Design a protein around this ligand. Structure first.
Ligand SMILES: [Ca+2]
Length: 308
């Protein structure tokens, strides 16, 4: 069962992105303004609004530098802003951006764009200055999403070209080490398995499916061999706009259809663990995260918080 524990209206426009660190959810909407929410299972409250006309168009992506309170925000502007901190103070502008994501060591910030590229930026302990170390142009269409592995410097990008690409460095020489071919429409997002050891990834698409991909070792050329090992059971009717793979082993998906589903892997097979229809009323749902509880963000400007 998926139970609503709290419903929080934040904007009157779409929520596109959110991210959780250190008990705080950051959110992004068609708005200039970034909103921060304190979250506990008490909880569940507004604490700050980030603006200062930094701030020109829709905030398509927000991400916390992991286990810290520094924040990055990417915009339809083509720009990406940086905040630190109560209150949050601005720090930098880096130069449509569709996604931002940090490596778990906190030193690399990846950005992706309608321009078909993925940029890798490096910073230090302080997060004050950003050096562009790679410009990664292999996708043939709009890149929708970037995410790093929980513990390796491995990056996954998802694109309107129907592929996920995996990127890895050898001494800051970042290159594409696999192209995950199989989805039949735009891949909106992906997330890595949190199981220790060799890698897997799930991805959600316009084609109404969630695929689970499995790494099958390096080839002779130091490229990675990857196959789609499963397609999850039917849920969505059907753009799948976001997926999230929790440390609990469970995958969550959300779609244009207003459904939130959870899947569990037992004895080498996936089953729907739980599902709920009309989670944002009549509204498309764009984003989902495991916080353990679920947060969903929808076209109605609400973040719903659900218990499992
Ligand atoms: Ca399907």
């Amino acid at each position: 069962s998926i139970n609503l524990i709290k419903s929080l209206k934040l904007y009157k426009e779409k929520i596109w992105s959110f991210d959780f660190s250190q008990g705080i959810l950051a959110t992004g909407s068609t708005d200039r303004k970034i909103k921060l929410v304190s979250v506990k299972y008490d909880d569940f409250t507004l604490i700050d609004v980030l603006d200062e006309t930094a701030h020109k168009k829709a905030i398509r992506s927000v991400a916390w530098r992991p286990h810290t309170s520094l924040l990055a925000a990417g915009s339809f502007d083509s720009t990406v802003s940086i905040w630190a901190k109560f209150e949050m103070d601005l720090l930098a502008i880096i130069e449509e951006v569709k996604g931002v994501a940090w490596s778990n060591d906190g030193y690399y910030l990846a950005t992706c764009s309608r321009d078909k590229s993925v940029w890798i930026w490096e910073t230090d302990e302080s997060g004050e200055e950003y050096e562009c170390i790679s410009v990664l142009q292999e996708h043939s269409q709009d890149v929708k999403h970037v995410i790093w592995h929980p513990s390796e410097a491995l990056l996954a990008s998802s694109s309107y070209d129907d592929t996920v690409r995996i990127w890895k460095d050898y001494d800051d020489d970042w290159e594409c080490v696999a192209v995950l071919n199989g989805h039949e429409g735009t891949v909106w997002s992906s997330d890595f398995d949190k199981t220790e050891g060799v890698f897997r990834l799930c991805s959600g698409s316009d084609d109404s499916t969630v695929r689970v991909w499995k790494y099958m070792g390096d080839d002779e050329d130091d490229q990675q061999e990857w196959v789609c090992e499963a397609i999850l059971p039917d849920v969505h009717k059907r753009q799948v706009y976001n997926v999230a793979w929790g440390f609990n082993g469970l995958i969550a998906s959300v779609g244009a259809d207003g459904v939130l589903a959870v899947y569990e892997e037992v004895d080498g097979e996936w089953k729907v663990f739980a599902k709920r229809a009309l989670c944002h009323g009549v509204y498309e749902i764009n984003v989902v995260k495991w916080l353990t509880i679920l947060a969903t963000g929808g076209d109605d400007g609400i973040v719903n918080f659900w218990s499992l």
